[PDB]
Design a binder for this molecule. Structure first.
Ligand SMILES: NC(=O)c1ccc[n+]([C@@H]2O[C@H](COP(=O)([O-])OP(=O)(O)OC[C@H]3O[C@@H](n4cnc5c(N)ncnc54)[C@H](OP(=O)(O)O)[C@@H]3O)[C@@H](O)[C@H]2O)c1
Ligand SMILES: NC(=O)c1ccc[n+]([C@@H]2O[C@H](COP(=O)([O-])OP(=O)(O)OC[C@H]3O[C@@H](n4cnc5c(N)ncnc54)[C@H](OP(=O)(O)O)[C@@H]3O)[C@@H](O)[C@H]2O)c1
Ligand SMILES: CC(C)CC(=O)C(=O)O
Ligand SMILES: CC(C)CC(=O)C(=O)O
Lengths: 310, 309
């Protein structure tokens, strides 16, 4: 019923694009390194939640200008190349399209917004999912998959903004995925950092997946201390998270399957880490509030050092 | 002045050899590399002084075989006092001076209950870049000075200054720089400003001093850690000299690329000196109500790494 465009068909874009297509939506994929392989072989998903899923043939595109105008654009690219990202979105966007950034970090919508026409709605999609590019054209989905949507900016008034976020959530729900409308995209991005900041960084730094990090008492105490810093930074910036929120997130991660965070896969494959959106932007916002995050600041410095080493 | 060396590694081998090369009667107790040292001897390749060779050397595999020494240079690691203590006692002459050429905080006090109260327990702060190369070979890269401080023993206020002065004179006799320190605790805190950031980050970031100093992010991290140790020392009653971080950084800039002792330990599978270098300063700072979040986090990361397969 809706024409969906996927700008950046990686683990996230491939997964959500495939899931929507399997729900009967008209999905068009823009691919980069794997366009040729996915164009011929197709898209396939190994998922512990949804079983094996395949799309063949896929409506795949190597040029964004080849794509037809889409009502929703699912941005699955990393936050690392914003000026490379913007021209593609405008090309594939139908009049008044909804742009949904399926991206981690803080301040990402504001940073992309100057390049996007004011006629386009800009939304944030916070994905709680364990997923990675496993094999060329194959997506490895380990757990979860829910997406929470929030409206950032666009021509909609307050009622229409809620309707558009609800419309986006319902699309994923129709696909068999969990989805809720968030009242405050900025508050939700801060909440998501409480998990991404310790786990993404320590997985790279300590060369470890989630289970050994939770099993060892020192890493677990370090994770909790980092969580408190992010929660304090969120509070200092005007967003007070729920009571005992660190304990809730720690408990759920213990129930998580053994998992290597997205940033771990990035570091192993030599891809740029999303340090700017996940670490630098929270650190800068907290500094503006006069709130120091010593452990996060030190972790960011170590991550930058590791990226720069031969 | 019979000198004994308990733990003839890089540190014990270096200072023992320098004393022996200066005519002293030095007796080396060895562990893993005894048979190698007993045949080849001790060779010192020093970028500061040059090449020195001690062959043959008075080498021992058990402290029981050692004669009673007036000075005991302890160059062992701080990770096995239960093994270390009977060795010191067996090699100690009556009223001997035990010099702990070891990093960390609280090191002497942790050893004092296992040594007779008639022995003089001293600390030796060694600012030096030295490591064991091939068996029997000591690779000395930079610096080498030792500052001495008195911790415990039967000596009165007068003899405590004389004993610390006598030990410093031995090292100055051998061509080394050596200063008598009035406060061993403050001097140990000073040495921690270097070993806390550089030992841990070398293991954590799988790197040596040159890459850590050349990268702007790791350099800022080192500095931030240094200010934590400085602030903790001041919170515990020991105000360190001003701009000591900058002085340490400048010395490290003029250091050849160096792997701290803890880096060699991790690579060889030996236990890391975390208890003396991190746990003790953290607990001491905690009792003073001073928090070291970066050092606390570094210590947790190191404990994680040491427990991994
Ligand atoms: N479990 C997860 O993976 C997860 C969970 C939550 C949130 N996220 C967030 O989702 C976003 C993507 O993460 P990911 O795991 O999916 O990484 P990924 O597997 O590397 O996917 C990123 C995709 O974007 C493509 N891309 C980037 N620029 C492009 C351009 N101009 N044109 C066409 N394609 C372009 C990349 O192409 P190439 O593959 O050819 O390089 C890649 O396919 C990140 O912001 C991440 O924080 C990920
Ligand atoms: N440039 C430096 O190396 C440097 C500088 C400043 C401070 N330090 C500190 O000096 C001390 C020793 O450093 P290092 O570089 O000489 O290490 P090292 O090369 O490993 O030398 C240690 C020597 O003592 C032995 N040993 C280790 N633990 C022992 C124990 N519980 N009991 C008896 N003997 C033991 C070792 O036996 P094996 O032969 O079997 O290994 C070895 O012979 C450490 O506290 C270190 O932090 C070193
Ligand atoms: C639920 C998290 C594992 C997803 C995420 O944010 C990531 O892997 O980067
Ligand atoms: C004086 C330093 C270069 C030595 C040190 O801290 C070490 O190697 O453990």
């Amino acid at each position: 019923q809706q024409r969906i465009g996927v700008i950046g068909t990686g683990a996230i874009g491939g997964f959500y694009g495939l899931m929507l297509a399997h729900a009967g939506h008209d999905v068009h994929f823009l691919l980069r390194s794997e366009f040729e392989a996915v164009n011929r072989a197709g898209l396939s998903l190994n998922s512990a939640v949804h079983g094996f899923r395949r799309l063949a043939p896929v409506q795949a595109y190597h040029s964004a200008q080849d794509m037809p105008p889409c009502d929703w654009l699912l941005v699955g690219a990393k936050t690392t190349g914003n000026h490379e990202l913007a021209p593609l979105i405008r090309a594939a966007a139908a009049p008044g399209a909804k742009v949904l950034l399926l991206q981690n970090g803080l301040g990402v919508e504001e940073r992309l917004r100057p390049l996007l026409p004011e006629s386009l709605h800009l939304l944030g999609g916070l994905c709680f999912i364990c997923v990675h590019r496993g094999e060329p054209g194959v997506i490895e989905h380990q757990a979860y998959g829910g997406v929470n949507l929030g409206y950032h900016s666009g021509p909609a008034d307050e009622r229409r903004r809620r309707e558009i976020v609800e419309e986006g959530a319902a699309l994923f729900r129709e696909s068999g995925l969990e989805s809720t409308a968030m009242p405050d995209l900025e508050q939700a991005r801060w909440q998501k950092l409480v998990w991404n900041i310790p786990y993404n960084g320590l997985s790279v730094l300590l060369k470890s997946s989630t289970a050994p990090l939770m099993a060892n008492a020192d890493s677990r105490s370090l994770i909790e201390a980092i969580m408190e810093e992010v929660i304090g930074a969120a509070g200092a910036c005007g967003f007070i998270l729920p009571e005992g929120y660190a304990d809730q997130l720690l408990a759920a991660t213990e129930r998580m399957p053994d998992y290597r965070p997205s940033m771990y896969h990035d570091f192993a494959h030599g891809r740029p880490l999303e340090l700017a959106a996940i670490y630098a932007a929270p650190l800068a916002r907290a500094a503006a509030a006069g709130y120091r995050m010593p452990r996060v600041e030190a972790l960011h410095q170590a991550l930058r050092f590791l990226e720069a080493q031969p």
